[PDB]
Design a protein around this motif. Structure first.
Motif, short mmCIF file in Angstrom:
data_model
loop_
_atom_site.label_atom_id
_atom_site.label_comp_id
_atom_site.label_asym_id
_atom_site.label_seq_id
_atom_site.Cartn_x
_atom_site.Cartn_y
_atom_site.Cartn_z
N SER A 23 0.83 -1.21 0.00
CA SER A 23 0.00 0.00 0.00
C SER A 23 0.87 1.26 0.00
CB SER A 23 -0.95 0.01 1.20
OG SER A 23 -2.08 -0.82 0.98
N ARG A 26 2.34 2.59 -3.39
CA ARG A 26 1.35 3.23 -4.27
C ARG A 26 1.27 4.74 -4.04
NH1 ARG A 26 0.08 1.57 -8.81
NH2 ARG A 26 -1.79 2.90 -8.65
N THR A 27 1.73 5.19 -2.87
CA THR A 27 1.67 6.60 -2.51
C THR A 27 3.07 7.21 -2.38
OG1 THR A 27 1.40 5.91 -0.18
CG2 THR A 27 -0.60 6.47 -1.41
N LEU A 28 4.07 6.49 -2.90
CA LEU A 28 5.47 6.93 -2.92
C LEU A 28 6.09 7.10 -1.53
CD1 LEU A 28 5.27 9.52 -5.83
CD2 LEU A 28 6.41 7.31 -5.89
N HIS A 29 5.44 6.58 -0.50
CA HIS A 29 6.01 6.65 0.84
C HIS A 29 7.18 5.67 0.94
CE1 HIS A 29 2.03 8.52 1.71
NE2 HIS A 29 2.79 9.28 2.49
N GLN A 307 0.08 6.78 6.06
CA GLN A 307 -0.11 7.71 4.94
C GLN A 307 -0.78 8.99 5.41
OE1 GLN A 307 -2.20 4.73 2.72
NE2 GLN A 307 -0.55 4.44 1.23
N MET A 308 -1.84 8.85 6.19
CA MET A 308 -2.62 9.99 6.65
C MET A 308 -1.78 10.91 7.52
SD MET A 308 -6.28 10.14 8.69
CE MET A 308 -7.09 9.13 7.47
N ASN A 311 1.50 12.34 5.51
CA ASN A 311 1.03 13.36 4.58
C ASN A 311 0.76 14.69 5.29
OD1 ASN A 311 1.18 11.60 2.42
ND2 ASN A 311 -1.04 11.39 2.16
N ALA A 312 0.01 14.62 6.38
CA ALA A 312 -0.37 15.82 7.13
C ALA A 312 0.86 16.53 7.69
CB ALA A 312 -1.34 15.46 8.25
N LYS A 314 3.97 16.48 6.59
CA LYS A 314 4.73 17.12 5.52
C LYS A 314 4.04 18.37 4.98
CE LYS A 314 4.96 13.54 2.76
NZ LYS A 314 5.27 12.74 1.54
N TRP A 315 2.81 18.19 4.48
CA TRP A 315 2.20 19.21 3.63
C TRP A 315 1.48 20.33 4.38
CZ3 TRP A 315 5.01 18.48 -0.12
CH2 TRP A 315 5.23 17.22 -0.70
N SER A 316 1.30 20.18 5.69
CA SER A 316 0.69 21.24 6.49
C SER A 316 1.68 22.36 6.79
CB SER A 316 0.13 20.68 7.80
OG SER A 316 1.16 20.19 8.63
N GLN A 317 2.95 22.12 6.48
CA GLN A 317 4.02 23.10 6.71
C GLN A 317 4.16 24.06 5.53
OE1 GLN A 317 7.80 21.31 7.58
NE2 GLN A 317 8.86 23.28 7.83
N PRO A 318 4.05 25.38 5.77
CA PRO A 318 4.14 26.34 4.66
C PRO A 318 5.51 26.39 4.00
CG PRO A 318 4.16 27.49 6.76
CD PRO A 318 3.85 26.06 7.07
N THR B 49 -3.26 -3.12 -3.99
CA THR B 49 -3.28 -3.45 -2.55
C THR B 49 -3.47 -4.94 -2.24
OG1 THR B 49 -5.66 -3.27 -1.96
CG2 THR B 49 -4.40 -1.18 -2.17
N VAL B 142 -4.78 5.56 -3.59
CA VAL B 142 -3.97 4.38 -3.32
C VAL B 142 -4.11 3.40 -4.49
CG1 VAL B 142 -3.51 2.43 -1.75
CG2 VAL B 142 -4.26 4.62 -0.82
N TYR B 146 -0.35 6.64 -8.90
CA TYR B 146 1.09 6.41 -9.00
C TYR B 146 1.57 6.58 -10.44
CZ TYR B 146 5.61 4.09 -8.95
OH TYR B 146 6.95 3.80 -9.08
N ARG B 169 -8.78 18.64 2.13
CA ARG B 169 -7.41 18.65 2.65
C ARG B 169 -6.78 17.27 2.56
NH1 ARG B 169 -5.72 17.79 8.13
NH2 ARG B 169 -3.71 18.77 8.62
N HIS B 170 -7.52 16.27 3.03
CA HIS B 170 -7.08 14.88 3.03
C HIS B 170 -6.70 14.39 1.63
CE1 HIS B 170 -6.97 10.65 4.34
NE2 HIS B 170 -7.61 10.39 3.21
N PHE B 173 -3.67 16.38 0.05
CA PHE B 173 -2.38 15.92 0.56
C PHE B 173 -1.93 14.62 -0.11
CE2 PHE B 173 -2.42 18.16 4.99
CZ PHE B 173 -2.35 19.39 4.35
N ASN B 177 1.57 14.26 -3.25
CA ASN B 177 2.65 13.30 -3.40
C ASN B 177 2.93 12.99 -4.87
OD1 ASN B 177 2.85 13.11 -0.59
ND2 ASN B 177 1.48 11.34 -0.49
N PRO B 202 -0.94 29.06 1.93
CA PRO B 202 0.45 29.21 2.35
C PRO B 202 1.31 27.97 2.11
CG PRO B 202 -1.01 30.12 4.00
CD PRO B 202 -1.88 29.42 3.00
N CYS B 203 0.66 26.83 1.90
CA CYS B 203 1.37 25.57 1.67
C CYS B 203 1.47 25.24 0.18
CB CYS B 203 0.69 24.43 2.42
SG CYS B 203 0.59 24.69 4.21
N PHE B 205 -1.14 25.31 -2.15
CA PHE B 205 -2.33 24.71 -2.74
C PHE B 205 -3.23 25.78 -3.35
CE2 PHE B 205 -1.94 20.31 -1.43
CZ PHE B 205 -1.01 20.39 -0.41
#
Ligand SMILES: Cc1cc2nc3c(=O)[nH]c(=O)nc-3n(C[C@H](O)[C@H](O)[C@H](O)COP(=O)(O)OP(=O)(O)OC[C@H]3O[C@@H](n4cnc5c(N)ncnc54)[C@H](O)[C@@H]3O)c2cc1C
Ligand SMILES: Cc1cc2nc3c(=O)[nH]c(=O)nc-3n(C[C@H](O)[C@H](O)[C@H](O)COP(=O)(O)OP(=O)(O)OC[C@H]3O[C@@H](n4cnc5c(N)ncnc54)[C@H](O)[C@@H]3O)c2cc1C
Lengths: 318, 318
Positions: A23, A26-29, A307-308, A311-312, A314-318, B49, B142, B146, B169-170, B173, B177, B202-203, B205
Motif C-alpha cells: 500500500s 502506491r503513494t510513494l512513501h 499515509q494519513m 502526509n499531514a 509534511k504538507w501542512s508546513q508552509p 493493494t 492508493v 502512481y 485537505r485529506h 495531501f 505526493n 500558504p502551503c 495549494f
C-alpha cells in the motif's frame, strides 16, 4: 539531513508487513521491511483462504508478493536482519522520531512504525507433538483437513485453550465433516470427557480421557499413532488443536504499547494505531483472529494510518 | 429430499463472494455463487493493494480465483444469472430455509445466505464526468495515481461527499505526493474555496471555485481539460473524487436487514451476520471501507459464520 529518514519502519516481512509495504509504494512513501527469516506458516505445505493462492506454497506467496513490489516500485527496501530494539527517541537531533537497532547495532530512523512481527505457537509438551505438528496435527480445519477427508477417524485434542466443552464441540463438528468417527482426546480430564459423552455421545462422537504418552507421525501421510499411558495405542487420521500463542520480540514491551486481555496489542479503529502515537500493528500480533486474510487487511489499514499522518506532517508546513 | 439444499446461497461473484466460496470449499460445505456479470471495478485498468496482483487486471484476478476453486473442489457451483428476489420461507415444506429467484423464476434453496452484491457509484452529473471516470478521475489515490506521478498538476473535486475542508485537505495531501501543483475544485462553492485558500494557500495549494461546465478526457492518457462556466479552460493531470454509493439489488429490503446511518448493512461481530439470523454480508455492501482487502477478509469471516451454524445444525442431531 543526509541520514535517511524513512516514512515507516515495518518490523516483519510476513503477510502483514508485505501488505503494508504494498500500500505504501502506491503513494510513494518510503519504508524498510525488516525480516529475520522465520514466518509463522513457513512449515505449512500450502496456503488457504487467500484468493488465487489456495493449495500453493506459502513461501512462494511471500516471494511473489515481494517481487511484485520490487519489480515496479523503489521506495521500499528490504533488510534481512534481526532487530533487537525499537525506541521513540526522547532526545538528540531526531527527538520524536523512531529508531530500530539490529544485532550488529546498525540503526534506521523513521517517522512511523508498523509492528508486524507476528506470534509463535506454544506447543503442548506431549512426546512427539512437535514432530506431528503441521504433519498430522492442524491448528485450523479451514487451513488443513480437506486433504484428509475420508479418514477412518479424526481427533480433537481438547487441552489447554481447547479444554472447554464449547471448544471441543466446535472443533469436533469441523472434524465430523472429514470423517465418520470423531474422537475427542481430553488427556486425563475426566470431567470434560463425561460432558462430551453426555452431550455428543448420542450424536456418534467418542470421548477418550486416557493420558497420551506419545504421538507418532507416519512419514507417508497425516495419520498418527496415539499411545496411551496404559500401554495401548490406536491410529487416528488427523488431530485438530489450537496452541496458545505469544507475540514475538521485545518490541511491544520496549515501546510500552497497551496489551489486551486476549494478549494481542490493543488497536485503535480503523488504522490499527497502538496506544503509542505513530506506532501501528498489523497481523497476528494485533488481533484475536490470527489468520492470513486478517493480516492482509490489517496491513492495508496500518499503511493507511501512516499515509494519513505522514502526509499531514509534511504538507501542512508552509 | 431430492431438491438440492445448499448450505449457502452466495449472492455475488465479486471479491467478497469468491472469498466466501474459497473458505467454504475447504470444509466441504455446499453453495451456489450467483453472478449477474457486472463488478464494481470491471472498468479498472488494474487491481491494487492485493498481494501478488498489483498492476494486474482485476478480471484476471476474479477468473484466477474461480479457476483456483473449480480446479480442485466440487461443492461450490457458479450460476451466471440475475436474481430478483431472496426470501426466508415462512411456510411450505422448507419453512425456515432461504430461497432465491432469478429472472426466469428458477429457484435455489439454502440454509444460509451471504449478501455480497456490492454497491454502485453515484456519479456527479457534470458533462463529461462519466467518460473521464476511471480514465482521469480516480476514486482512491492508493488504487490509482502512481502512474500519474510527475503530472504538471492534479485536482481534487471537492463536491458532495467531498465538500468539506477536512476531506478536501485529506485528498489534496494525497495528490501532493504525485504533483507539485494541486488544485481543489469546489465547483461554485465559494466558502469552501476561501477556507482552502486560508489554510492551504500558504502551503502552495490552489483553490478554484468556478463552476465546471465540462470535463474532456484525453484518449492517450489520464490528462483532462477542465472547462469552466466563464468559457475559459485548463488542463489537469488527474482528479480525485469519491462519489457516494448505493447498495445494489432489492435483497436488503426484501429480507428486512437493518441498515446503518453510513448506509451499509449492519454487521454483528465477528462473522458479519446481519440482523436476520442466517444471513451474512461481505464486501462493499457490508462496511464503510469499500475496498478489495476488506472484501476478502469479510468473505472469509462470513463463511466462518455459515460454517459454525451449519455444522451445529447438522451434527447436534442424534
Ligand atoms: C502451520 C500453520 C499454518 C497456517 N496456514 C494458514 C493458511 O493456510 N491460510 C491463512 O490464512 N493463515 C494460515 N496460518 C496463519 C498465518 O500464518 C498468519 O496469520 C500469518 O502468517 C500472520 O502474518 P504476520 O505478518 O502477522 O506474521 P508472520 O507471517 O509470521 O511474519 C512475521 C515477520 O516478522 C519478522 N520478525 C519477527 N521478529 C523479528 C525480529 N526481531 N527482527 C526482524 N524481524 C522479525 C519475522 O522474521 C517475519 O518476517 C497458519 C499458521 C500456522 C502456524
Ligand atoms: C474504478 C474502481 C476501481 C477500484 N480499484 C480497486 C483496487 O485497485 N484495489 C482494491 O482493493 N479495491 C478497488 N476498488 C474497490 C473494489 O472494487 C471493491 O471493494 C470490491 O469490488 C468489492 O467486492 P464486492 O464482492 O463487495 O462487490 P463486486 O466486486 O462489485 O461484486 C458484486 C457481485 O454481486 C453480483 N450481483 C449484484 N447484483 C446481483 C443480482 N441481482 N443478481 C445476481 N448477482 C448480482 C454482481 O454480479 C457481482 O458478481 C475499485 C472500485 C472502483 C469503482
Amino acid at each position: 539531513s543526509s541520514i535517511p529518514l524513512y516514512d515507516c519502519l515495518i518490523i516483519g516481512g510476513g503477510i502483514a508487513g508485505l501488505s503494508s509495504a504494498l500500500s505504501l509504494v502506491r503513494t510513494l512513501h518510503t519504508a524498510v521491511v525488516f525480516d529475520e527469516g522465520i514466518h509463522r506458516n513457513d512449515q505449512a505445505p500450502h496456503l488457504a483462504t487467500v484468493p488465487t493462492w489456495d493449495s500453493q506454497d506459502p513461501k512462494r506467496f511471500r516471494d511473489a508478493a515481494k517481487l511484485n513490489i520490487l519489480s515496479k516500485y523503489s521506495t521500499v527496501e528490504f533488510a534481512n536482519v534481526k532487530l533487537e530494539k525499537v525506541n521513540q527517541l526522547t532526545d538528540g537531533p531526531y527527538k520524536g522520531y523512531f529508531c530500530v537497532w539490529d544485532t550488529k547495532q546498525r540503526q534506521w530512523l523513521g517517522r512511523k512504525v508498523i509492528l508486524a512481527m507476528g506470534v509463535e505457537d506454544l506447543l503442548p509438551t506431549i512426546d512427539g507433538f512437535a514432530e506431528c505438528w503441521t504433519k498430522g496435527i492442524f491448528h485450523c480445519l479451514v487451513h488443513r483437513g480437506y486433504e484428509e477427508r475420508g479418514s477412518a477417524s479424526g481427533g480433537v485434542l481438547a487441552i489447554d485453550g481447547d479444554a472447554t466443552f464449547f471448544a471441543a464441540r466446535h472443533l469436533a463438528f469441523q472434524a465430523r465433516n472429514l470423517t465418520d468417527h470423531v474422537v475427542i482426546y481430553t488427556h486425563g480430564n475426566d470431567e470434560l470427557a463425561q460432558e462430551v459423552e453426555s452431550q455428543l455421545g448420542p450424536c456418534g462422537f467418542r470421548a477418550e480421557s486416557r493420558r497420551i504418552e506419545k504421538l507418532v507421525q507416519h512419514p507417508e501421510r497425516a495419520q498418527m499413532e496415539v499411545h496411551f499411558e496404559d500401554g495401548q495405542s490406536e491410529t487416528v487420521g488427523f488431530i485438530v488443536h489450537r496452541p496458545r500463542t505469544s507475540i514475538r520480540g521485545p518490541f511491544a514491551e520496549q515501546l510500552g504499547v497497551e496489551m489486551t486481555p486476549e494478549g494481542h496489542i490493543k488497536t485503535q479503529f480503523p488504522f490499527n494505531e497502538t496506544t503509542v502515537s505513530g506506532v501501528f500493528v498489523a497481523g497476528d500480533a494485533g488481533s484475536q483472529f490470527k489468520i492470513g486474510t486478517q493480516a492482509v487487511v490489517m496491513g492495508a489499514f496500518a499503511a493507511g494510518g501512516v499515509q494519513m499522518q505522514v502526509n499531514a506532517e509534511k504538507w501542512s508546513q508552509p
